[PDB]
Amino acid sequence: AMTSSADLTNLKELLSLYKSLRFSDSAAIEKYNSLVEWGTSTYWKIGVQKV
Amino acid sequence: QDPMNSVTVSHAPYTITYHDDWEPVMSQLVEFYNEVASWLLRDETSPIPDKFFIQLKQPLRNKRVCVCGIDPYPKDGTGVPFESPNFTKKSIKEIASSISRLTGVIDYKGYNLNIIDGVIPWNYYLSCKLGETKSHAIYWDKISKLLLQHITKHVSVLYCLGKTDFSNIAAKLESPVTTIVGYHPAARDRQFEKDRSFEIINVLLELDNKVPINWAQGFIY
């Protein structure tokens, strides 16, 4: 889609995790990094790197 | 006067005025325009020749977002992308609805992207034959590619309206930029009504530590 509410939701979550960045487990870090992979793939480039 | 410059070409409009920020592409532009313009000036165009390049007067250094259409309005192009100074065109009216709902501004007389802080509205191709869309693709081609590369060294985000029109846009650019391709505001099934490209842009900026865009500044009351 690149343009839907679902996209907006996913990017809002990625923004959320970027702010705190104090993860507490494998799933949280895997989530964030999988969000970044998704963002870079969908919108080509974005401002944040994988941790 | 101070940030502005001029260069002379062999064909209408004969003089091209630009902001200093465009300087690194003007040499090539002159060259390419001189080779095509004769062929291109045969048709009545939208907008008129004298308005083709007015968007080169915009600075680029303060620009976070480029909002991009494929070519000008087939009739009544002012030289400024998206602008309907009497607020007539569907595209700008529909964009205004989006922005209405997103900011809850109920009452307004019109809307202009070219007054909005940090946005540069753009047209990939600079003219079309009166009443015909994409009629001048073949002539603009290498210029459009040249000008759009320049814009994407300065913007964080490129927002293109037209899935079909901008499918293979990344191929037109050398170096990456945050790129989003949404629906053209006149599209089947109201798909643009449900498009959230404006919220999405703002999140993407925030992810680049850039200040989001105040979409509401574009209203005219």
UniProtKB/Swiss-Prot annotation, chain A:
Plays an essential role in viral DNA replication by acting as the polymerase processivity factor together with protein OPG116. Serves as a bridge which links the DNA polymerase OPG071 and the uracil DNA glycosylase. Interacts with the DNA polymerase catalytic subunit OPG071. Interacts with UDG/OPG116. Component of the uracil-DNA glycosylase(UDG)-OPG148-polymerase complex; OPG148 and UDG form a heterodimeric processivity factor that associates with OPG071 to form the processive polymerase holoenzyme. Interacts with OPG117. Belongs to the orthopoxvirus OPG148 family. This is DNA polymerase processivity factor component OPG148. It comes from Vaccinia virus (strain Copenhagen) (VACV). The chain holds residues 1 to 50 of 426 of the full protein.
UniProtKB/Swiss-Prot annotation, chain B:
InterPro entries: Ura-DNA_Glyclase_AS, Uracil-DNA_glycosylase-like_sf. Changing P176G: About 50% loss of interaction with OPG148. GO terms for molecular function: DNA binding; uracil DNA N-glycosylase activity. GO terms for biological process: DNA repair; viral DNA genome replication. It catalyses: Hydrolyzes single-stranded DNA or mismatched double-stranded DNA and polynucleotides, releasing free uracil. Keywords: DNA damage, DNA repair, DNA-binding, Hydrolase. The active site is at D71. It is an enzyme of class 3 (hydrolase). Its EC number is 3.2.2.27. CDD domains: UDG_F1_VAVC_D4-like. Belongs to the uracil-DNA glycosylase (UDG) superfamily. UNG family. Homodimer. Interacts with protein OPG148. Component of the Uracil-DNA glycosylase(UDG)-OPG148-polymerase complex; OPG148 and UDG form a heterodimeric processivity factor that associates with OPG71 to form the processive polymerase holoenzyme. Plays an essential role in viral replication as a component of the DNA polymerase processivity factor. Excises uracil residues from the DNA which can arise as a result of misincorporation of dUMP residues by DNA polymerase or due to deamination of cytosine. This is Uracil-DNA glycosylase.
